[PDB]
Design an enzyme around this catalytic site. Structure first.
Site, short mmCIF file in Angstrom:
data_model
loop_
_atom_site.label_atom_id
_atom_site.label_comp_id
_atom_site.label_asym_id
_atom_site.label_seq_id
_atom_site.Cartn_x
_atom_site.Cartn_y
_atom_site.Cartn_z
N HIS A 82 31.69 -26.24 -2.73
CA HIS A 82 30.75 -25.25 -3.20
C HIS A 82 29.79 -25.82 -4.26
O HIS A 82 30.19 -26.64 -5.15
CB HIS A 82 31.55 -24.10 -3.78
CG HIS A 82 30.71 -23.09 -4.46
ND1 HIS A 82 29.70 -22.39 -3.84
CD2 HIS A 82 30.76 -22.62 -5.73
CE1 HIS A 82 29.13 -21.56 -4.69
NE2 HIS A 82 29.79 -21.67 -5.83
N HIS A 137 27.97 -24.76 -7.12
CA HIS A 137 28.09 -23.61 -8.01
C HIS A 137 26.77 -23.23 -8.67
O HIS A 137 26.27 -23.96 -9.53
CB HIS A 137 29.21 -23.87 -9.07
CG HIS A 137 29.47 -22.68 -9.94
ND1 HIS A 137 30.70 -22.03 -10.00
CD2 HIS A 137 28.64 -21.97 -10.73
CE1 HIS A 137 30.61 -21.01 -10.83
NE2 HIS A 137 29.38 -20.96 -11.30
N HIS A 150 32.15 -28.41 -6.63
CA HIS A 150 33.61 -28.58 -6.68
C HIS A 150 34.17 -28.20 -5.33
O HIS A 150 33.63 -27.28 -4.67
CB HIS A 150 34.23 -27.72 -7.81
CG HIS A 150 33.87 -26.25 -7.77
ND1 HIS A 150 34.58 -25.33 -7.04
CD2 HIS A 150 32.96 -25.53 -8.47
CE1 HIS A 150 34.13 -24.11 -7.29
NE2 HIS A 150 33.13 -24.21 -8.14
N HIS A 182 36.11 -25.90 -2.97
CA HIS A 182 36.43 -24.49 -2.94
C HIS A 182 37.53 -24.25 -1.91
O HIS A 182 37.49 -23.29 -1.16
CB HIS A 182 35.17 -23.66 -2.64
CG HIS A 182 35.11 -22.34 -3.38
ND1 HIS A 182 36.10 -21.38 -3.25
CD2 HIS A 182 34.28 -21.89 -4.33
CE1 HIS A 182 35.79 -20.34 -3.99
NE2 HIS A 182 34.73 -20.64 -4.71
N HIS A 185 39.76 -13.31 -18.05
CA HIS A 185 39.49 -13.89 -16.72
C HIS A 185 37.98 -14.06 -16.61
O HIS A 185 37.26 -13.07 -16.60
CB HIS A 185 39.97 -12.90 -15.67
CG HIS A 185 41.45 -12.66 -15.72
ND1 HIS A 185 42.36 -13.64 -15.37
CD2 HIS A 185 42.18 -11.62 -16.20
CE1 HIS A 185 43.58 -13.17 -15.54
NE2 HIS A 185 43.50 -11.96 -16.07
N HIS A 243 33.29 -14.75 -11.34
CA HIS A 243 32.13 -15.46 -10.82
C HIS A 243 31.70 -14.73 -9.55
O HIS A 243 32.53 -14.52 -8.66
CB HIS A 243 32.59 -16.84 -10.46
CG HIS A 243 31.53 -17.64 -9.81
ND1 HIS A 243 30.20 -17.53 -10.18
CD2 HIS A 243 31.58 -18.45 -8.74
CE1 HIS A 243 29.49 -18.33 -9.41
NE2 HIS A 243 30.29 -18.75 -8.45
N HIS A 260 29.28 -15.24 -6.26
CA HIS A 260 28.43 -16.16 -5.46
C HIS A 260 27.15 -15.46 -5.06
O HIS A 260 27.12 -14.23 -4.95
CB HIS A 260 29.19 -16.58 -4.19
CG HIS A 260 30.32 -17.51 -4.47
ND1 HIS A 260 30.50 -18.72 -3.82
CD2 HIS A 260 31.29 -17.43 -5.40
CE1 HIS A 260 31.58 -19.33 -4.33
NE2 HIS A 260 32.08 -18.54 -5.26
N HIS A 276 35.30 -13.65 -7.68
CA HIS A 276 36.69 -14.02 -7.99
C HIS A 276 36.82 -14.54 -9.40
O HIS A 276 35.82 -14.90 -10.05
CB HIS A 276 37.25 -15.08 -7.03
CG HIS A 276 36.51 -16.38 -7.10
ND1 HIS A 276 36.84 -17.38 -7.99
CD2 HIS A 276 35.39 -16.80 -6.45
CE1 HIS A 276 35.97 -18.37 -7.88
NE2 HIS A 276 35.13 -18.07 -6.91
N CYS A 277 38.07 -14.59 -9.88
CA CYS A 277 38.32 -15.26 -11.12
C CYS A 277 38.17 -16.76 -10.93
O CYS A 277 38.63 -17.33 -9.94
CB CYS A 277 39.76 -14.97 -11.62
SG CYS A 277 39.97 -15.81 -13.17
N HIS A 278 37.51 -17.42 -11.87
CA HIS A 278 37.28 -18.84 -11.72
C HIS A 278 38.35 -19.70 -12.40
O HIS A 278 38.23 -20.91 -12.55
CB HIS A 278 35.86 -19.18 -12.25
CG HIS A 278 35.22 -20.31 -11.49
ND1 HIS A 278 35.78 -21.57 -11.42
CD2 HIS A 278 34.14 -20.33 -10.67
CE1 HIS A 278 35.00 -22.35 -10.66
NE2 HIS A 278 34.04 -21.60 -10.14
N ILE A 279 39.43 -19.04 -12.83
CA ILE A 279 40.65 -19.78 -13.12
C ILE A 279 41.33 -20.12 -11.78
O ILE A 279 41.67 -19.24 -11.02
CB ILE A 279 41.61 -18.96 -14.04
CG1 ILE A 279 40.93 -18.83 -15.41
CG2 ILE A 279 42.91 -19.73 -14.20
CD1 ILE A 279 41.62 -17.80 -16.41
N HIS A 315 44.51 -18.66 -10.55
CA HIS A 315 44.46 -17.25 -10.24
C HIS A 315 43.81 -16.97 -8.88
O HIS A 315 44.25 -16.06 -8.15
CB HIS A 315 43.76 -16.45 -11.35
CG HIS A 315 44.39 -16.62 -12.70
ND1 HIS A 315 43.78 -16.21 -13.87
CD2 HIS A 315 45.54 -17.22 -13.08
CE1 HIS A 315 44.56 -16.50 -14.90
NE2 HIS A 315 45.61 -17.16 -14.45
N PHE A 320 43.28 -13.68 -6.58
CA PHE A 320 42.45 -12.85 -7.47
C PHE A 320 40.96 -12.92 -7.03
O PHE A 320 40.12 -13.49 -7.73
CB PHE A 320 42.61 -13.34 -8.92
CG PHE A 320 42.39 -12.25 -10.00
CD1 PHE A 320 42.39 -10.89 -9.68
CD2 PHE A 320 42.41 -12.61 -11.34
CE1 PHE A 320 42.24 -9.92 -10.66
CE2 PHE A 320 42.27 -11.66 -12.39
CZ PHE A 320 42.17 -10.29 -12.03
#
Ligand SMILES: *[C@@H]1O[C@H](CO)[C@@H](O[C@@H]2O[C@H](CO)[C@@H](O[C@@H]3O[C@H](CO[C@H]4O[C@H](CO)[C@@H](O)[C@H](O)[C@@H]4O)[C@@H](O)[C@H](O)[C@@H]3O)[C@H](O)[C@H]2NC(C)=O)[C@H](O)[C@H]1NC(C)=O
Ligand SMILES: *[C@@H]1O[C@H](CO)[C@@H](O[C@@H]2O[C@H](CO)[C@@H](O[C@@H]3O[C@H](CO[C@H]4O[C@H](CO)[C@@H](O)[C@H](O)[C@@H]4O)[C@@H](O)[C@H](O)[C@@H]3O)[C@H](O)[C@H]2NC(C)=O)[C@H](O)[C@H]1NC(C)=O
Ligand SMILES: *[C@@H]1O[C@H](CO)[C@@H](O[C@@H]2O[C@H](CO)[C@@H](O[C@@H]3O[C@H](CO)[C@@H](O)[C@H](O)[C@@H]3O)[C@H](O)[C@H]2NC(C)=O)[C@H](O)[C@H]1NC(C)=O
Ligand SMILES: *[C@@H]1O[C@H](CO)[C@@H](O[C@@H]2O[C@H](CO)[C@@H](O[C@@H]3O[C@H](CO)[C@@H](O)[C@H](O)[C@@H]3O)[C@H](O)[C@H]2NC(C)=O)[C@H](O)[C@H]1NC(C)=O
Ligand SMILES: *[C@@H]1O[C@H](CO)[C@@H](O[C@@H]2O[C@H](CO)[C@@H](O)[C@H](O)[C@H]2NC(C)=O)[C@H](O)[C@H]1NC(C)=O
Ligand SMILES: *[C@@H]1O[C@H](CO)[C@@H](O[C@@H]2O[C@H](CO)[C@@H](O)[C@H](O)[C@H]2NC(C)=O)[C@H](O)[C@H]1NC(C)=O
Ligand SMILES: *[C@@H]1O[C@H](CO)[C@@H](O[C@@H]2O[C@H](CO)[C@@H](O)[C@H](O)[C@H]2NC(C)=O)[C@H](O)[C@H]1NC(C)=O
Ligand SMILES: *[C@@H]1O[C@H](CO)[C@@H](O[C@@H]2O[C@H](CO)[C@@H](O)[C@H](O)[C@H]2NC(C)=O)[C@H](O)[C@H]1NC(C)=O
Ligand SMILES: *[C@@H]1O[C@H](CO)[C@@H](O)[C@H](O)[C@H]1NC(C)=O
Ligand SMILES: *[C@@H]1O[C@H](CO)[C@@H](O)[C@H](O)[C@H]1NC(C)=O
Ligand SMILES: [O-][O-]
Ligand SMILES: [O-][O-]
Ligand SMILES: [Cu+2]
Ligand SMILES: [Cu+2]
Ligand SMILES: [Cu+2]
Ligand SMILES: [Cu+2]
Ligand SMILES: [Cu+2]
Ligand SMILES: [Cu+2]
Ligand SMILES: [Cu+2]
Ligand SMILES: [Cu+2]
Ligand code: NA
Ligand code: NA
Ligand SMILES: [Zn+2]
Ligand SMILES: [Zn+2]
Ligand SMILES: [Zn+2]
Ligand SMILES: [Zn+2]
Ligand SMILES: [Zn+2]
Ligand SMILES: [Zn+2]
Ligand SMILES: [Zn+2]
Ligand SMILES: [Zn+2]
Ligand SMILES: [Zn+2]
Ligand SMILES: [Zn+2]
Ligand SMILES: [Zn+2]
Ligand SMILES: [Zn+2]
Ligand SMILES: [Zn+2]
Ligand SMILES: [Zn+2]
Ligand SMILES: [Zn+2]
Ligand SMILES: [Zn+2]
Lengths: 497, 497
Positions: free
Chosen positions: A64, A66, A109, A111, A395, A398, A400, A450-453, A456, A461
Site C-alpha cells: 500500500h 499510504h 508498506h 498491507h 487507536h 486510517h 484509505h 482500520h486501526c493502524h496498529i 490490531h 479491527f
C-alpha cells in the site's frame, strides 16, 4: 532516491539496525525500504518483484502507498483481500498510478497481515515544484527525511499477539537497544544558518512516539500530506502512520544535539542513548550530544493545526449534519477486535473483485457486516468513541482513498466545522473522547478503514467503506496482471503463503 | 455464619455460578467461601484442612485474612514464601489470631499464586457490639453482606497470563454470562421502612467494578474496615480487595430494583441482565426488575472519605516529612512486573523464616532488592507514581499488617495531611497520578506490599516491607505446626504442588 519508475525487489535477509542480528523482510536489500520520490503530477510505476523465501514472515505480499487517493486505480491501493490478492513469490506485479492533485510526505508498506512490521515499510515523498511553503526553507532532500520505526527482535508471527512495545526505536533505520554494547546512532547533518524542511514519517507498527530535538523548535507546515498554516511547536506526539513536515532553523551554536523519539510504552526514556539520534552541525566533533531536554512549552495539539488552503468541511455545522452519519462501536474479546459487533475476517475473493463481479449491496458483500456501502457524492460523518472495551488505546484510525476533516480531535470537546485540519490518520484518543471525522464520497471504490496498529488490524479491527458500488467497475478498470493475481494466489500451497 | 472457631476444608469440585459448569477450588463445598464472623476482641482459630486433589489449580494452599493486622502473629498472615510455606494436600494447619482493636468488613483468600481466582475467596465480618454507627441502621447480618467476584470459564493456570476481564460478574456468588440461557440472579431481600447496613466486599482477581442500586442512594460508613464519617453517594467504584459498608434506607415503593456491578473492562454493561442482581422488597413479584439507571450525581470520590475517629497522619505536613520516604518505580517487560527494577520471585525459604534464622539486613534477605528493611516506630511515606510502563492500570496496591493514610488519592493533586481516609487497598490511578500513603511501623515483621490484581502479583508486582527485623523473632513466636510446614512442603513431588 528512486522513482517515479522503479523496481522494488522483496527478499528476506539478516539485518542488525540496533546491533541485534535477525532475519527480516527487506526491499532492494534494506529496511526501512528505499525512499521513493517524484513530483506532483507524476505517474508512478512501481514494479514489485517478490523474491521472498521465508514463510514465517510470509512469502506473499501486497504493498500500500499510504496517503495516495488512488482515484481510478483502486486495484493498486494494496490491502490484501480488499483491493487485491497477494502477489506470490517468484512473481512481479506493477503498481501504476498517478498523483495529479497531491504532494507531500507519504510512505509505503506491506498491507498483508503484520508483514510491514518485519521490515517492509519505507518513506515516499512527492515534491511540489510550486510548493506554497518553499520560501520557508533552504534545503529539502533525501537527507531531510526522518523516519521512525518500532523494531522487534522476535518476528511478528513468532512473538506475542499484542507485544508490549518494541525492543528499540530506529530513527533513519538506526537506534540502540537496552543491552551492554551501544550500536551506532543515526546522524542528521545540518549547516549552521540554513533552514531545513524535515519530513517526519512514522513507520510504526504499534506505539506512538513523542518527538523533539534538544534546543530547537519545529514549525509544522504539513500534516499527513496536507499543507498547514505554519505552527511552531517544541514537541510532537506522532501516531503510527502519520506524517509532518516541520522547518528547523539551524541557528543554534555548532554542536551535537539529541533528537528524541520516546515511544508511548515499552522501553521508554533515553538511558544509554536509546530512542535517540544525533543532529550534528557541520564542524561539531563526532561524539554523542550532551544536550538537555526541557519540558515542552508548546507541544503540538491537533486542534491547533489548520489547512493552509481553505478546505470546507462537508455537510452542515451540527452533529449529524451530513448525508450518512455512522457511529463505530469498538469491542474486544481478548484475541479479536470488533466494530459494530463484527471482527474483520479477510474474504477469499477480494472485496473489489466481488464488486466488479456484480455484488453492489452491503447484504451481498462479504465479510457480512464489515462492508459499509456508501452513496456517491455525499457527506459522511464517522465517530470513533473511545472505550476501555477496546484496549491498546489510543487507536490511530486510517481511512484509505481520502483525507477527512477531523471535526473533533482527541482530548478536545470542541467541534470545529469551520477550519479543522484534514488528514488521513487520527488518534481516537482515550475513554471520554469521541473523535469525529467527515469526508465526501468523491472516489468510487472500496476503501479500508482500520486501526493502524498493525497487531490490531490483524486481529480484525477494520471495516470497508465501499462507496459508489454501481460505478466502481467503470471508474476502476483493472489491468490484466491484476486479474491474474487471484488465480496465482489461490493455487499456492499453504507452505508458500 | 461460622467462626470464630471453625474448620475450613479445601476441596476441588464442579460449580456453575453463572450457568457454566467448571472445576473450581471450594471451601466447605462452596465458592465464594463461607462467611466467617466474630466480634471485636475474639480469638479466631481457623483450621485449614487441605483436601485438594487438582494440581492444575494447585494442591497446596495458603490463606490470608485480608485487612487483619496480625500483630504478634505474622506467621499466620498467609502470603506463600513471605509468611509461610504452603500447606500440603492431606494436611491441616491452624490459623490462630486475635482481633483486639479492629472491627469491620474483611475477607479471606488463597495467597498462593493465582489460586484465589479459581474460587478460594470469601467474606469475613467482625461485628462491634459498641459500633459507633449502630443507630444508623436496623439490620446487619449474613444477608446484608454483598460480595463481588470476577468469574472465568477457563482456570487461572490454563488461560491467558493477563485475561481481558472475566466471563461473568457474580454478586453473592450468582451472575449471568453472555450466552443464550440466562442463569439465576442473586436476590437481596429488604422490607420497606427498614435500614440496612450492607457490607460490600470486592473479591475480585482483577477488574474494578462500578456498583450502584437503581433508585437508591448509599451512605458509606466504613472503608476497608475503618469507620468513616457518613458519606452519601449514588455510585461506588470499588477496586479489587476493597470493602465499604453503606446504609441503604429501603424507603422506595415495594418493587424489584437492579443492583449493578459494572466491571471496568471485559463484558461490560447490563445486556441480558449481566453484571446485575436484584434488590427485592418483600411483596414484590418474583420477576426481574425493570428499574432504570441514571448518571450518578454523587459518585464516591476517595478524597471525600474521612475517618470517623480522628486519626493523625504520621510525620510532618510536607512531601518527604517522614522518617523513611520511598518512591516506587513501576515497570513491565511484557511478562513480568517490576518495582525499582526487581520482579518479585518468591524465595524457597519464607522471608519470615529467613528473619527468624538471623537474616536482619536488607542485603542478607532474599529475593535481593525486593525486601525493604524498615526501622521500628517510624513514619514511612510511599509514593506509587502511575506510568504507562505498568500496563493494566489503575493498580490497586495493598499493604499487609497496617492501615495507611492516603495522603494523595488518584485523580487528585491535593495532599491531605490533616484528615485523610486510612485504608488498606488503594487505587494507584493513571499516568499523571502520584498516589501517596503514610503509615507508622508499629507491627514488627515482614509485610507484603503488592498489586491486588492477582495476575500482576503472580507476574512479580510485589515487594516485602520488613519492619523491625531485630525484634521480629521475639514479637512473633511461631507454633510448632508452622515450623513443620516447610519440611512437609519441600518434600512434595512437583506433581503434588
Ligand atoms: C525465517 O524467519 C524467521 C522469523 O524471523 C526466523 O525465525 C528465527 O528462528 C530462529 C530459530 O528458531 C529463532 O532462533 C532463536 O533465537 C534466539 C537467539 O537470540 C540470541 O540470544 C542472544 C542474546 O539475546 C543473541 O545475541 C544470540 O545471537 C542469539 O541469537 C534463541 O534464544 C532461541 O533459542 C532461538 O535460537 C529466532 O529468534 C527467529 N527470529 C526471529 C526474528 O523471530 C527464521 O530463522 C527464518 N528462516 C531462515 C532460513 O532464515
Ligand atoms: C483440574 O482442574 C482443571 C482447571 O479447572 C480442569 O481443567 C479442565 O480441563 C478440561 C479437559 O482438558 C478442559 O476441557 C475443555 O473444555 C471445553 C468445554 O467447554 C464447553 O464448551 C461448551 C460451550 O462453551 C460447553 O457448554 C460444553 O459443556 C463444554 O464443556 C472444550 O472446548 C475443550 O476442548 C475441553 O473440553 C476445561 O476447560 C478445563 N477447565 C477449566 C476451568 O479451565 C480439569 O478438568 C480438572 N481435573 C479434574 C479431574 O476435574
Ligand atoms: C459519539 O458521537 C456520536 C455522533 O454524534 C453519538 O451518536 C449520536 O448520539 C446522538 C445523541 O444521543 C443521537 O442523536 C439523536 O437524538 C434524537 C433526539 O433524542 C433521537 O431521536 C435520535 O434517534 C438520535 O438518538 C444520534 O442518533 C447518534 N448518531 C449516530 C450516527 O449514531 C454517540 O452517542 C457518541 N458516543 C459517545 C460515547 O459519546
Ligand atoms: C511522586 O512523589 C515522590 C515523592 O514526593 C517524588 O519523589 C520525590 O521527588 C522530589 C522532587 O523532585 C525529590 O525532592 C528532592 O529535592 C531536593 C531539592 O532539589 C533534592 O536535593 C533531593 O535530592 C530530592 O530530589 C525527592 O527526592 C523524591 N523523593 C523520593 C523518596 O524519591 C516523585 O518524583 C513523584 N513522581 C512523579 C512521577 O510525580
Ligand atoms: C540547550 O538548552 C538547555 C536548557 O534549556 C541549555 O541549558 C540552559 O541554559 C541556560 C542559559 O545558559 C542555563 O543558565 C540553564 O541552567 C540551562 N537550563 C537547564 C535546564 O540546564 C543548554 O545549554 C542548551 N544547549 C545544550 C547543548 O544543551
Ligand atoms: C473472540 O472472537 C473471535 C471471533 O468471534 C473468536 O474466534 C472464532 O471462534 C469460533 C470458535 O472457535 C470459530 O468458529 C471461528 O473460527 C473463530 N475465528 C477466529 C478464531 O478468528 C474467538 O475465539 C473469540 N475468543 C475468545 C477468547 O472468546
Ligand atoms: C427510579 O428512577 C427513575 C429515573 O430516575 C424513575 O423514572 C423517572 O421518574 C420520573 C418521575 O416519575 C419520570 O417523570 C421520569 O421520566 C423518569 N426518568 C427517567 C430517566 O426515566 C423511575 O420511575 C424510578 N423507579 C423505577 C422502578 O425505575
Ligand atoms: C522479563 O523479565 C523477566 C525477569 O527478568 C525475565 O524472566 C527471566 O529470564 C531469564 C532468561 O530466561 C531467566 O534467567 C529467568 O529464569 C527468568 N525469570 C522468569 C522467566 O520468571 C523474562 O524473560 C523477561 N521477559 C521478556 C519477554 O523479556
Ligand atoms: C453532487 O451533489 C451536489 C448536491 O449536493 C451537486 O450540486 C453537484 O453537482 C455534485 N457534485 C459534484 C462535485 O459532482
Ligand atoms: C516511638 O518514638 C517516639 C518519638 O518519635 C517516642 O516518643 C515514643 O516513645 C515511641 N512510641 C511508641 C508508641 O512506642
Ligand atoms: O495504511 O494502512
Ligand atoms: O491481599 O493480598
Ligand atoms: Cu498505512
Ligand atoms: Cu493508507
Ligand atoms: Cu488499535
Ligand atoms: Cu490501511
Ligand atoms: Cu487480599
Ligand atoms: Cu492483605
Ligand atoms: Cu496491577
Ligand atoms: Cu496480599
Ligand atoms: Na467488551
Ligand atoms: Na518500560
Ligand atoms: Zn539468512
Ligand atoms: Zn508461480
Ligand atoms: Zn487555531
Ligand atoms: Zn453479522
Ligand atoms: Zn476524497
Ligand atoms: Zn473561520
Ligand atoms: Zn458514480
Ligand atoms: Zn504455514
Ligand atoms: Zn469433578
Ligand atoms: Zn503428607
Ligand atoms: Zn471532605
Ligand atoms: Zn538487584
Ligand atoms: Zn500499623
Ligand atoms: Zn482539620
Ligand atoms: Zn521493636
Ligand atoms: Zn506441574
Amino acid at each position: 532516491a528512486i522513482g517515479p519508475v522503479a523496481d522494488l525487489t522483496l527478499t528476506n535477509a539478516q539485518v542488525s539496525p540496533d546491533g541485534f542480528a535477525r532475519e527480516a523482510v527487506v526491499v532492494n536489500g534494506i529496511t526501512p525500504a528505499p525512499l521513493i520520490t517524484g513530483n506532483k503530477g507524476d505517474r508512478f510505476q512501481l514494479n514489485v518483484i517478490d523474491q521472498l523465501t521465508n514463510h514465517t514472515m510470509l512469502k506473499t505480499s501486497s504493498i500500500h502507498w499510504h496517503g495516495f487517493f488512488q482515484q481510478g486505480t483502486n486495484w493498486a491501493d494494496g490491502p490484501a483481500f480488499v483491493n487485491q490478492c497477494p502477489i506470490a513469490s517468484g512473481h512481479s506485479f506493477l503498481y501504476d498510478f498517478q498523483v495529479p492533485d497531491q504532494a507531500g510526505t507519504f510512505w509505503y508498506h506491506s498491507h498483508l497481515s503484520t508483514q510491514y512490521c518485519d521490515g517492509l515499510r519505507g518513506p515516499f515523498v512527492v515534491y511540489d515544484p510550486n510548493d506554497p511553503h518553499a520560501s520557508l526553507y533552504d534545503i529539502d532532500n533525501d537527507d531531510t527525511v526522518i523516519t521512525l520505526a518500532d523494531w522487534y527482535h522476535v518476528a511478528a508471527k513468532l512473538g506475542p499477539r499484542f507485544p508490549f512495545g518494541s525492543d528499540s526505536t530506529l530513527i533513519n533505520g538506526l537506534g540502540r537497544t537496552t543491552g551492554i554494547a551501544p550500536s551506532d546512532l543515526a546522524v542528521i547533518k545540518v549547516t549552521q544558518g540554513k533552514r531545513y524542511r524535515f519530513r517526519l514519517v512514522s513507520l510504526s507498527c504499534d506505539p506512538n512516539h513523542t518527538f523533539s530535538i534538544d534546543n530547537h523548535t519545529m514549525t509544522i507546515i504539513e500534516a499527513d500530506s496536507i499543507n498547514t498554516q505554519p505552527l511552531e511547536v517544541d514537541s510532537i506526539q506522532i501516531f503510527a502512520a502519520q506524517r509532518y513536515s516541520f522547518v528547523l532553523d539551524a541557528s543554534q551554536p555548532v554542536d551535537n544535539y539529541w533528537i528524541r523519539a520516546n515511544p508511548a510504552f515499552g522501553n521508554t526514556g533515553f538511558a544509554g542513548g536509546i530512542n535517540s539520534a544525533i543532529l550534528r552541525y557541520d564542524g561539531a566533533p563526532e561524539i554523542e550530544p550532551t544536550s538537555v531536554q526541557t519540558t515542552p512549552t508548546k507541544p503540538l495539539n491537533e486542534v491547533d493545526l489548520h489547512p493552509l488552503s481553505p478546505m470546507p468541511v462537508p455537510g452542515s455545522p451540527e452533529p449529524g449534519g451530513v448525508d450518512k452519519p455512522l457511529n463505530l462501536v469498538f469491542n474486544f474479546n481478548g484475541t479479536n477486535f470488533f466494530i459494530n459487533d463484527h471482527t474483520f475476517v479477510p474474504p477469499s475473493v477480494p472485496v473489489l473483485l466481488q464488486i466488479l463481479s456484480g455484488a453492489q449491496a452491503a447484504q451481498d458483500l462479504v465479510p457480512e457486516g464489515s462492508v459499509f456501502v456508501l452513496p456517491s457524492n455525499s457527506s459522511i460523518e464517522i465517530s470513533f468513541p473511545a472505550t476501555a472495551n477496546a484496549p491498546g488505546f489510543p487507536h490511530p484510525f486510517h481511512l484509505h482513498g481520502h483525507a477527512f476533516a477531523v471535526v473533533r480531535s482527541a482530548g478536545s470537546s470542541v467541534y470545529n466545522y469551520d477550519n479543522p485540519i484534514f488528514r488521513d490518520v487520527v488518534s481516537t484518543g482515550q475513554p471520554g473522547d469521541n473523535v469525529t471525522i467527515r469526508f465526501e464520497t468523491n472516489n468510487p471504490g472500496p476503501w479500508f478503514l482500520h486501526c493502524h496498529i498493525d497487531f490490531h488490524l490483524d486481529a480484525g479491527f477494520a471495516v470497508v467503506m465501499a462507496e459508489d458500488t454501481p460505478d466502481t467497475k467503470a471508474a476502476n478498470p483493472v489491468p490484466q496482471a491484476w486479474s491474474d493475481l487471484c488465480p496465482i494466489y489461490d493455487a499456492l500451497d499453504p507452505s508458500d503463503l
